[PDB]
Design a protein around this motif. Structure first.
Motif, PDB file in Angstrom:
ATOM      1  N   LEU A   1       0.853  -1.159   0.000  1.00  0.00           N
ATOM      2  CA  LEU A   1       0.000   0.000   0.000  1.00  0.00           C
ATOM      3  C   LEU A   1       0.893   1.214   0.000  1.00  0.00           C
ATOM      4  N   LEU A   2       0.593   2.114  -0.924  1.00  0.00           N
ATOM      5  CA  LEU A   2       1.366   3.316  -1.116  1.00  0.00           C
ATOM      6  C   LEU A   2       0.528   4.551  -1.020  1.00  0.00           C
ATOM      7  N   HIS A   3       1.088   5.595  -0.419  1.00  0.00           N
ATOM      8  CA  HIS A   3       0.575   6.953  -0.543  1.00  0.00           C
ATOM      9  C   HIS A   3       1.571   7.722  -1.414  1.00  0.00           C
ATOM     10  N   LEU A   4       1.102   8.279  -2.529  1.00  0.00           N
ATOM     11  CA  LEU A   4       2.011   8.819  -3.528  1.00  0.00           C
ATOM     12  C   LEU A   4       1.628  10.239  -3.951  1.00  0.00           C
ATOM     13  N   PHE A   5       2.532  11.185  -3.712  1.00  0.00           N
ATOM     14  CA  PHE A   5       2.236  12.596  -3.898  1.00  0.00           C
ATOM     15  C   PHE A   5       2.756  13.176  -5.210  1.00  0.00           C
ATOM     16  N   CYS A   6       2.072  14.212  -5.671  1.00  0.00           N
ATOM     17  CA  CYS A   6       2.445  14.961  -6.852  1.00  0.00           C
ATOM     18  C   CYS A   6       2.357  16.435  -6.547  1.00  0.00           C
ATOM     19  N   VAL A   7       2.970  17.237  -7.421  1.00  0.00           N
ATOM     20  CA  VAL A   7       3.065  18.676  -7.196  1.00  0.00           C
ATOM     21  C   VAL A   7       3.241  19.414  -8.517  1.00  0.00           C
ATOM     22  N   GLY A   8       2.722  20.638  -8.568  1.00  0.00           N
ATOM     23  CA  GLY A   8       2.868  21.439  -9.770  1.00  0.00           C
ATOM     24  C   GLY A   8       2.679  22.920  -9.467  1.00  0.00           C
ATOM     25  N   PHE A   9       3.160  23.777 -10.355  1.00  0.00           N
ATOM     26  CA  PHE A   9       3.059  25.214 -10.152  1.00  0.00           C
ATOM     27  C   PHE A   9       2.650  25.857 -11.445  1.00  0.00           C
ATOM     28  N   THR A  10       1.705  26.785 -11.386  1.00  0.00           N
ATOM     29  CA  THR A  10       1.332  27.551 -12.572  1.00  0.00           C
ATOM     30  C   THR A  10       2.533  28.246 -13.233  1.00  0.00           C
TER      31      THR A  10
ATOM     32  N   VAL B   1      -0.536   3.232 -10.819  1.00  0.00           N
ATOM     33  CA  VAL B   1       0.043   2.404  -9.757  1.00  0.00           C
ATOM     34  C   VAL B   1      -0.753   1.124  -9.534  1.00  0.00           C
ATOM     35  N   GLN B   2      -2.069   1.225  -9.681  1.00  0.00           N
ATOM     36  CA  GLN B   2      -2.939   0.057  -9.635  1.00  0.00           C
ATOM     37  C   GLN B   2      -2.327  -1.051 -10.481  1.00  0.00           C
ATOM     38  N   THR B   3      -2.282  -0.838 -11.797  1.00  0.00           N
ATOM     39  CA  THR B   3      -1.602  -1.777 -12.667  1.00  0.00           C
ATOM     40  C   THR B   3      -0.106  -1.567 -12.521  1.00  0.00           C
ATOM     41  N   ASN B   4       0.595  -2.617 -12.096  1.00  0.00           N
ATOM     42  CA  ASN B   4       2.062  -2.669 -11.924  1.00  0.00           C
ATOM     43  C   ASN B   4       2.559  -2.685 -10.473  1.00  0.00           C
ATOM     44  N   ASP B   5       3.532  -3.570 -10.243  1.00  0.00           N
ATOM     45  CA  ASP B   5       4.173  -3.840  -8.940  1.00  0.00           C
ATOM     46  C   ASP B   5       5.267  -2.852  -8.516  1.00  0.00           C
ATOM     47  N   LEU B   6       5.692  -2.938  -7.250  1.00  0.00           N
ATOM     48  CA  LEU B   6       6.620  -1.967  -6.679  1.00  0.00           C
ATOM     49  C   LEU B   6       7.776  -1.660  -7.635  1.00  0.00           C
ATOM     50  N   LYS B   7       8.209  -2.692  -8.361  1.00  0.00           N
ATOM     51  CA  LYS B   7       9.291  -2.577  -9.344  1.00  0.00           C
ATOM     52  C   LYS B   7       9.004  -1.676 -10.546  1.00  0.00           C
ATOM     53  N   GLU B   8       7.802  -1.767 -11.108  1.00  0.00           N
ATOM     54  CA  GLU B   8       7.447  -0.939 -12.270  1.00  0.00           C
ATOM     55  C   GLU B   8       7.185   0.492 -11.881  1.00  0.00           C
ATOM     56  N   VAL B   9       6.568   0.695 -10.722  1.00  0.00           N
ATOM     57  CA  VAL B   9       6.517   2.038 -10.179  1.00  0.00           C
ATOM     58  C   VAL B   9       7.949   2.561 -10.163  1.00  0.00           C
ATOM     59  N   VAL B  10       8.861   1.819  -9.545  1.00  0.00           N
ATOM     60  CA  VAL B  10      10.264   2.179  -9.594  1.00  0.00           C
ATOM     61  C   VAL B  10      10.777   2.444 -11.019  1.00  0.00           C
ATOM     62  N   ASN B  11      10.719   1.441 -11.891  1.00  0.00           N
ATOM     63  CA  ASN B  11      11.067   1.606 -13.314  1.00  0.00           C
ATOM     64  C   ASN B  11      10.424   2.827 -13.976  1.00  0.00           C
ATOM     65  N   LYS B  12       9.199   3.127 -13.550  1.00  0.00           N
ATOM     66  CA  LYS B  12       8.456   4.338 -13.925  1.00  0.00           C
ATOM     67  C   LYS B  12       8.960   5.685 -13.384  1.00  0.00           C
ATOM     68  N   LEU B  13       9.329   5.717 -12.106  1.00  0.00           N
ATOM     69  CA  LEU B  13       9.691   6.955 -11.425  1.00  0.00           C
ATOM     70  C   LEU B  13      11.081   7.402 -11.826  1.00  0.00           C
ATOM     71  N   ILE B  14      11.852   6.532 -12.469  1.00  0.00           N
ATOM     72  CA  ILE B  14      13.232   6.875 -12.828  1.00  0.00           C
ATOM     73  C   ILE B  14      13.270   7.808 -14.061  1.00  0.00           C
ATOM     74  N   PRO B  15      12.649   7.383 -15.182  1.00  0.00           N
ATOM     75  CA  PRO B  15      12.561   8.265 -16.343  1.00  0.00           C
ATOM     76  C   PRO B  15      11.442   9.284 -16.198  1.00  0.00           C
ATOM     77  N   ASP B  16      10.781   9.291 -15.045  1.00  0.00           N
ATOM     78  CA  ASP B  16       9.811  10.325 -14.748  1.00  0.00           C
ATOM     79  C   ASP B  16       8.650  10.391 -15.730  1.00  0.00           C
ATOM     80  N   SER B  17       8.137   9.229 -16.148  1.00  0.00           N
ATOM     81  CA  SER B  17       7.070   9.121 -17.169  1.00  0.00           C
ATOM     82  C   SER B  17       5.711   9.644 -16.676  1.00  0.00           C
ATOM     83  N   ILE B  18       5.544   9.622 -15.361  1.00  0.00           N
ATOM     84  CA  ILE B  18       4.323  10.130 -14.787  1.00  0.00           C
ATOM     85  C   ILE B  18       4.321  11.616 -15.056  1.00  0.00           C
ATOM     86  N   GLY B  19       5.402  12.285 -14.639  1.00  0.00           N
ATOM     87  CA  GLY B  19       5.568  13.722 -14.821  1.00  0.00           C
ATOM     88  C   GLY B  19       5.047  14.120 -16.183  1.00  0.00           C
TER      89      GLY B  19
END
Lengths: 136, 126, 64, 215, 107
Positions: free
Chosen positions: D116-125, D158-176
RNA sequence: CGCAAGACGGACCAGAGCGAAAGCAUUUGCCAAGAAUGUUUUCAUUAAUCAAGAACGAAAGUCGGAGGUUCGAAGACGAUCAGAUACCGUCGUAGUUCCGACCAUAAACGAUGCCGACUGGCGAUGCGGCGGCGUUAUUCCCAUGACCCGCCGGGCAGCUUCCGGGAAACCAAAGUCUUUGGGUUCCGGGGGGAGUAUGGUUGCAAAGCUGAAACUUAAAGGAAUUGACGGAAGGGCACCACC
RNA sequence: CCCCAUGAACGAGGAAUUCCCAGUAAGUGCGGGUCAUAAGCUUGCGUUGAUUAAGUCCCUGCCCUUUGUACACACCGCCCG
């Protein structure tokens, strides 16, 4: 003494952790987990006068007594977390915090990254002693 | 410093120089003689102090016009210098390059002219 | 932690501090290696070209 | 009364990072010699080291940190697993500028492996160049719809994909980048990161996945 | 006789705002009133980076900052010359300034 | 490193918003509500402002619980001082926080009644509407969207102005006041005695509202101007000052 | 004034504090004024002649702006029970 390993390249790593407030300066390496210490010594112990608890020169002396046993036990290198009193306290660095860092880098240990870790609070718990301010 | 020439002195220097430039010189020794001829000055120390400051001026004038002094010769020199004008600079070279609208400025001014279009993009304040 | 002694030569005289006006600012060419150059405070009368013997050799002051 | 200086008794282990990262030899750490009256692996096992993603990747990842927690021990080797990503202090402080709207959305979600993860995001106008208002706020309408978009993605991602893909995801910053695509239709935005991830519940054990990830 | 048309510092359209605590007296002043000064500075400082660059591993690295937004009540910000009495005329100027951006070769 | 409690919503956050005012910054949902705008909708004078009456009303305090993390009106301590019951340090109280009742007061200041009209320039900004063969962002064009520029309302304001006001400080309202007359409501008539006495009223209490006199006294007070002077800021200058 | 005799404290000065930058400080004699007589004085003069800042506004004192002021016989001034 001892050493994690011969390593004519990379250096065994610990955490440096300096709390600089005014009226003292703590230097502190620990194991990168934190759970286990290694050589502490403050800017207090290496001078007498209370007034001079926190002066950079004392701070130097302390970072020197620290770096000694650091390189005397096994740490070859160290990543630093500098800090202030924090809380609702001042939130600015104390005077012999810089001095300690210059003293260990100069000493000839190794440096790696930096962050500040003073505790800043999504503010509250009313700050000490009352509304009209310390008058003085 | 301690020797800062006062107005009574400094004035006389501006004064003489204005009516004496072609007479005066580079050298202390001679103006000092000149102040005897062209002015009536009461003590010798004053006359010396005058000759001296006015020479310091002449030394300066003869290296670049000085902030508040005018003489007939310097006026003539500026006059001649203030003539210059070449092949001339605009040209501007065949064809004016317009910013358009400035093109529409002529277009709706009933006026032929040379041309070129490069005027686009907005356009922030500050 | 430390000891050494440092020779440094005056490059440029800055001006005077101390409220009493008795300490002279100085800029020092580092003598053993010119590729260094630092600001130090003086007790005595100092003039360009003469030499300081620095204990501390970091530090580098300012007012006081 | 003189006694037992303790390093002269202590033993060394080499902290090992998961596979998705790049180089994997984090550094070294000291524990007491195991005595039957003791489990040096005990005082070793839930330790967490926080390492910079830059040391972890090799770079632009100056900001960003990963928390690596020791999940088991094998002779002088200790195999750690993702425990969190935060930002530091300097970076975060540096984004937060006056005259612009600061937008935060966070979501708590269960991954494909239980975590279970709590995962934050942020942005500025962002003011856009030929603007000549000095400020550049967003409207309340905007932020409410922007936040919904950030939240929908973070749960979706995050629903689809395990702790590893979130990781694999957060590195190249694809969510961003994905946020950036879903939001520009609504309002500018400069910056944008998933800025923190917090491990809330851990699934049970399983050395299987841990080794899959290490080894 | 009223001195500043702004009274204290800018309210106008409120009647209330939460108060902050001075970072020196630990006093207490409305947030609308109160001198505020941002404070960004390198973890290391002036001299250090050279031993800090040499002693470190990493190929450059490239220094964090500490960020701190200060608040002072009037008496502290005056006291310590954060701000200084300005003539009946100069007081009216909100603006801000200096001539270069003092960062190493300033006063 | 974890966890518990209680507190509080920092940075972002502004001469920026909303609310009758007091006051009001975490997310999200529900509940009703409030202004502006748009509006060739509806009514036909519904309306302006107000004795009496009434709603709300920061803080402390008071009643009974929850609660007390934090800090702390009192007290006890350590210093300082000639004295120190203080400032300063420490311990620490009711209290702070929250619920249901009281209480009705704050330089509750914009120290400026409310409502209507008229008299003057420019650029900001929250917001609504309107217009552009302007920019940038997309798909096959879009519908998008954010901007730039202009126009118009109604916000809080600002800026510059021999209109004009005012004793001036100042003030686009404190203007349109001896050329004294748009509506309405309230309070003041030298200063002290005094928000005191006394009766009424409200309050559990603490206290609140209404509110004199005898006597006392020739200035109380405002504003601007200038020195003198400052353990206020930039200031200087001199061995009658220091170094 | 001399001559003899008697031969003191004082063996370096606390709190404080004056004055001083070049023939200056300091040592050192002389002459003039007072004067009949009377110099430990004052008032110059030459002789011998350094140490030491070479600046600054800290203390002190006074005048420079800006600022505050219930002061204006002006802080050695005028506020509460």
């Amino acid at each position: 003494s001892l050493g994690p390993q011969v390593a004519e390249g990379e250096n065994v790593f610990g955490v440096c952790h300096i709390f600089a407030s005014f009226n003292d300066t703590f230097v502190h390496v620990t194991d990168l987990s934190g759970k286990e210490t290694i050589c502490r010594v403050t800017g207090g112990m290496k001078v007498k006068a209370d007034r001079d608890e926190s002066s950079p020169y004392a701070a130097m002396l302390a970072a020197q007594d620290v770096a000694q046993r650091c390189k005397e036990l096994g740490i070859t290198a160290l990543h630093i977390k500098l800090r202030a009193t924090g809380g609702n306290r001042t939130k600015t660095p104390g005077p012999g915090a810089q001095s300690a860092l210059r003293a260990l880098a100069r000493s000839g240990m190794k440096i790696g990254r930096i962050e500040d870790v003073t505790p800043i609070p999504s503010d509250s718990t009313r700050r000490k002693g009352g509304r009209r301010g310390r008058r003085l | 410093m301690g020797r800062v020439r006062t107005k009574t002195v400094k004035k006389a220097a501006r004064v003489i120089i204005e009516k004496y430039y072609t007479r005066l010189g580079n050298d202390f020794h001679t103006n000092k003689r000149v102040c005897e001829e062209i002015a009536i000055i009461p003590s010798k120390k004053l006359r010396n102090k005058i000759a001296g400051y006015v020479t310091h001026l002449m030394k300066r004038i003869q290296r670049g016009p000085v902030r508040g002094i005018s003489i007939k010769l310097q006026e003539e020199e500026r006059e001649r210098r203030d003539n210059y004008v070449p092949e001339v600079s605009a040209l501007d070279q065949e064809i004016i390059e317009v910013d358009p609208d400035t093109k529409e400025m002529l277009k709706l001014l009933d006026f032929g002219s040379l041309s070129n279009l490069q005027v686009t993009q907005p356009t922030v304040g500050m | 932690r430390v000891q050494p002694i440092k020779l440094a030569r005056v490059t440029k005289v800055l001006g005077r501090t101390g409220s009493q006006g008795q300490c002279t600012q100085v800029r020092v060419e580092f003598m053993d290696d010119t590729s260094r150059s630092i600001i130090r405070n003086v007790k005595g009368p100092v003039r360009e070209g003469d030499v300081l013997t620095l204990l501390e050799s970091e530090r580098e002051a300012r007012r006081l | 009364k003189k006694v037992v200086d303790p390093f002269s008794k202590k033993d060394w282990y080499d902290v090992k990072a998961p596979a998705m990262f790049n180089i994997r030899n984090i550094g070294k750490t000291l524990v007491t010699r195991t005595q039957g009256t003791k489990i040096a692996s005990d005082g070793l096992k839930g330790r967490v080291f926080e390492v910079s993603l830059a040391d972890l990747q090799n770079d632009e990842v100056a900001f960003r940190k990963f928390k690596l927690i020791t999940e088991d021990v094998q002779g002088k080797n200790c195999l750690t697993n993702f425990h969190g990503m935060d930002l530091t202090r300097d970076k975060m402080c540096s984004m937060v500028k006056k005259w612009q709207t600061m937008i935060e959305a966070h979501v708590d979600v269960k991954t494909t492996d239980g975590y279970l993860l709590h995962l934050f995001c942020v942005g500025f106008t962002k003011k856009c160049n030929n603007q000549i208002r000095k400020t550049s706020y967003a409207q309340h309408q905007q932020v409410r719809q922007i936040r919904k978009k950030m939240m929908e993605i973070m749960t979706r991602e995050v629903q689809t994909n395990d702790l590893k893909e979130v990781v694999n995801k957060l590195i190249p910053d694809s969510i961003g980048k994905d946020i950036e695509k879903a939001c520009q239709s609504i309002y500018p935005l400069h910056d944008v990161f998933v800025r923190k991830v917090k491990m809330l519940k851990k699934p049970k054990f399983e050395l299987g996945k841990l080794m899959e990830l290490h080894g | 006789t009223k001195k500043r048309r702004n009274n204290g510092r800018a309210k106008k359209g409120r009647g209330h705002v939460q108060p902050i605590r001075c970072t020196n007296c630990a006093c207490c002043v409305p947030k609308d009133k109160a001198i505020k000064k941002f404070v960004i500075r390198n973890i290391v400082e002036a001299a250090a980076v050279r031993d800090i660059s040499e002693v470190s591993v990493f190929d450059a690295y490239v220094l964090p900052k500490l960020y701190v937004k200060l608040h002072y009540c009037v008496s502290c910000a005056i006291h310590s010359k954060v701000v200084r009495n300005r003539s009946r005329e100069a007081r009216k100027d909100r603006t801000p300034p200096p001539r270069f951006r003092p960062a190493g070769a300033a006063p």
